[PDB]
Amino acid sequence: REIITLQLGQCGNQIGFEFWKQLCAEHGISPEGIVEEFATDRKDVFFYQADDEHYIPRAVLLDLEPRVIHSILNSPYAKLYNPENIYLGNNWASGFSQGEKIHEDIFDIIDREADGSDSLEGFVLCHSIAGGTGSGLGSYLLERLNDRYPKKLVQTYSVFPNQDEDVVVQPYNSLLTLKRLTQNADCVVVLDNTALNRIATDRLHIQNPSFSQINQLVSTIMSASTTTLRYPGYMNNDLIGLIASLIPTPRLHFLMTGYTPLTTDKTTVLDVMRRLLQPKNVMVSTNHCYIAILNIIQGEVDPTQVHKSLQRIRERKLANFIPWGPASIQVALSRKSPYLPSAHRVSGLMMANHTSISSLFERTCRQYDKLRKREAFLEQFRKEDMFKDNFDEMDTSREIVQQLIDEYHAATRPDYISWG
């Protein structure tokens, strides 16, 4: 069915706008919005279709004190959207309280596109973790759309703040938002700034204007992850069947992402599979290993070569991973997109459950604990104190993510007959 996307945060609104720019380049529309007669493709799961010849993308544009949204206005894509949902803090708790006081009218904006379409499948949350304006508010609406509708699917697009230590309040914020993503979202697509910055410094020569480049990298990822849904495949071409294969344990819903062209600014399948398994073509940063991998192909692919290629990785002993179930590596095939200039014809995807990211989590679980011993880096905001007078909800969230780390460490081994 149809999928509604919601973007908040300034960085989130930017990457949502660039994503819709990428899809306007993808789909049979002009940059004004008007249909082009050159075109197979479906424009229904992400675009509301009138006959106003300007098919409006199904995005909910919410903000706090619009600054970059003015720059979103000065563009030729100002005729692509106008659903009139633009409305005028610093912490998780302050942003949570500010989202608390105005919940009725933003939820009326949600109920508007809920009543606008008749079929409903999923909500994509475009959000940055511990981002200030995004944090607190995004966790609040995440709690509310899961509590209000238990029949739909919740997916999230999320980056990870990592700068190798400055914001001293970030481990509290990420800790609480990770609780809310684990208990109020069914699947989370995890990215970080650091690995994409590393790959960007690898391909280009960039130090200062990194943001403008990594946005392009992210948008290529999010378009690629939706090519199987927008163009009709037969495997996991709905969101529900896609997420139903990727979760072996209901606490594990974090998906690793890669992309086989590391630079785009002939091939057989075993080549791109082996290039795919390398950690440098991976976009997300003791024995730590995958539980189950799904890889998705896009290009001119002969069908018998994929069988030989999977046989090749079986013979390589590149499978030095060992979970406790026979749920295995997964191949899928979709077409490369027509209708646009398409360089580097065959390109890959991976969607995998990897426990190396738990190290990333425990770094936050390290940092907050140190600040919890010092008690000088909570910054003592007034709404933060009124919202929780004892600050034991952060301690309870630390307990939940500690159980999450123990369940990860049990999921690494082939012994999960007992709970971890």
């Binding site: 479906r42 069908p303 179930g325």
Partner: protein, 278 residues
């Protein structure tokens, strides 16, 4: 190939959800005008509407299952097919016998499209603390999706690619019919419409999964509104699933790639032999 071999999946993911609740009921409880409108629909809403031939497709039933290749209380999950009718110059190649062989392939594939979406639909109903049913559900859904892909890109698509080369080299119509017959024989023989028992082990395999879906959703809705009498049925279903799996692997190992499917089903090589053969 667009409707039988599923070359438009948006048609199916719309049609199945809008059609299963009327389709599920027993024989002589369904009326054909209702289903004809719902079919004409999911064609006209989908982008499978672009081809010039979209009204040759009609719905009929097979009340007689795989028995006919040498039902009475259910229909639409045991009596369901599409017939794509033929004109006079096109009935020289694709005639009645080819259409029946295509239909008896498509009927066996309808069950593998059916059971996977039952598992995926019971997954979303629930997104110490009994969780062994999750392991069984995940094992079955991984199994049936791997079986589906293996049929999709091992048999159907490569021989269709071969047919696209063979029919462009034809010089008389006795080469066209010969290529079509060889295509039909290879695609029917390589799939699971061939053994002296015609693989009833696979029918029982999918039967215990539809029983698993049914019992698990009936228990979870009643619990939401014993816990060890419910455990015994799942343990029995797990035992039967493993037993029939070892039976399928034994019946493939006796007849000499084709050991392909095992290499995908167990990437690690676990459960690869839990009982020696002969």
């Amino acid at each position: 190939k667009r409707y039988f071999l599923m070359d438009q999946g948006d048609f199916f993911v719309h049609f199945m959800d809008l059609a299963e609740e009327e389709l599920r009921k027993p024989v002589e409880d369904i009326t054909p005008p209702r289903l004809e409108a719902l079919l004409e629909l999911a064609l006209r809403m989908s982008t499978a509407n672009t081809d010039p031939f979209k009204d040759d497709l009609k719905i009929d039933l097979m009340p007689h299952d795989l028995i006919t290749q040498l039902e009475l209380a259910l229909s639409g999950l045991e009596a369901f097919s599409f017939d794509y009718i033929v004109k006079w110059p096109l009935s020289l190649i694709i005639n009645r016998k080819a259409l029946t062989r295509y239909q008896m392939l498509f009927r066996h594939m309808f069950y593998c499209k059916h059971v996977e979406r039952q598992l995926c639909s019971v997954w979303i109903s629930n997104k110490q603390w009994f969780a062994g049913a999750f392991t069984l559900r995940q094992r079955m859904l991984n199994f049936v999706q791997n079986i589906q892909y293996y049929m999709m890109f091992e048999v159907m698509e490569p021989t269709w690619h071969i047919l696209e080369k063979n029919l462009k080299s034809a010089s008389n119509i006795d080469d066209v019919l010969g290529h079509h017959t060889g295509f039909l024989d290879t695609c029917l023989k390589d799939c699971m419409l061939t053994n002296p028992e015609l693989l009833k082990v696979f029918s029982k395999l999918m039967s215990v999964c539809v029983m698993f879906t049914n019992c698990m959703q009936k228990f979870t809705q009643s619990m939401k509104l014993l816990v060890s009498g419910f455990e015994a049925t799942i343990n029995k279903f797990d035992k039967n699933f493993s037993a029939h799996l070892l039976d399928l692997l034994a019946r493939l190992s006796i007849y000499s790639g084709m050991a392909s499917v095992i290499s995908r089903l167990d990437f690690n090589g676990f459960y690869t032999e839990r009982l020696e053969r002969l």
